[PDB]
Amino acid sequence: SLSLIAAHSHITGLGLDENLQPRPTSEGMVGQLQARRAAGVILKMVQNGTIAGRAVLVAGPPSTGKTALAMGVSQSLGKDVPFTAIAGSEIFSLELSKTEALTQAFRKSIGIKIKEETELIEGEVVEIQIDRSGHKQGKLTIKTTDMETIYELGNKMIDGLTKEKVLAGDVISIDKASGKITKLGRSFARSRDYDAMGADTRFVQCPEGELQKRKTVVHTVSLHEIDVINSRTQGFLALFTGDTGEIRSEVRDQINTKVAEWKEEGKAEIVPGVLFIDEVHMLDIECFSFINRALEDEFAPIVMMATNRGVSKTRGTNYKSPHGLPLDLLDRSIIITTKSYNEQEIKTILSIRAQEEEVELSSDALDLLTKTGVETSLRYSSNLISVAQQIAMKRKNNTVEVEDVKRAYLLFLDSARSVKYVQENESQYIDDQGNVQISIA
């Protein structure tokens, strides 16, 4: 995937053993042993696929691995298991209601693996002979790399051939169920015949193997995609534009019934996934009341929620809540907590980040960065690493040292020093009341 080195680019997954016992450092994660155990238990719950509609809350101080834990869960899940990560503010739209946005998010987190059986004949047509008066009759020859057979054509087949304007050297595919004819391309022997080629023309080889083939193909389509396709007459365009509107409830019920019928017949399989809502405290009370009932569904996915606020005010209400969330939602949610790191864990995290950013830190520089991290913040030192690397490179030195980190510390401030400077010079910065002294003398 197109990517650059990002904040969570080093997490290959939860470093869990066979017994769901975390390793001290593995797959790019350090510490948080209890939280990683809980995340692994939730991951195995997702993988089993029997339990439906479970809410998980991730709580802890900021910069403590909540989003890191979610990234690890996503990486462990891998592909073929949907994982929709959205922010708290993303659901607010001018087109969709909040309930509709949450419904679409929930349906995106469930995937349907559907099997379609197709029987086809493919080959390069060698000779076509058509006789017409009464109805017409004709014979046709199609060859493969190791087969050749002459077929007799009905009147409708001849009509289809004529309306497709098939000539010799063309590779075509016919569905014996409907008789529809699709022109794959032309043979290589006809390439020399022209100097400029039309937009439609394509040169393809002669297909190998048997002329008539049976094949089954599995497609991964989310529930939301099925709803959008079956809503309008061209919904698959809305799957890209996003102008889907508030899909009818009866459409969703029909799609649920259709998926159940397919699952009974064994041509569709359900692969439940994980819905991750970042910063759930930005949601409203209406959204939470919807989520409470949404989880009580057979098709409902497993919802992961990450919050950092303690006793804060729930949006849309006039009262404070234990995590910024109403008690009813907290009742139906199991909580995974995170713990602040010590010096050694911060040192290991900084070393991992330096390795990911291909920056060769020194021992003294690493110690200084660890001290700054424990004094101020982990993200501050993590961001200082690359700036120090650039300063060192400007000094035509291939390794970073204490002087480069010191210069990076001096140039780029943190939250504490910025607050100190804004408080020392309150008169030159605009305040809540709007007063500011632009003049100096």
């Binding site: 000779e127 076509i128 002979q129 006789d131 017409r132 010799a168």
Partner: peptide, 28 residues
């Protein structure tokens, strides 16, 4: 028919209910 005349029998049965090659192609 308008002069109170019956139509052709085969045409009647067809209307109640409703050799040489013409195209040959071969790759050289």
């Amino acid at each position: 028919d308008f002069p109170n005349a019956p139509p052709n029998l085969k045409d009647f049965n067809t209307n109640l209910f409703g050799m040489k090659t013409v195209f040959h192609s071969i790759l050289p």
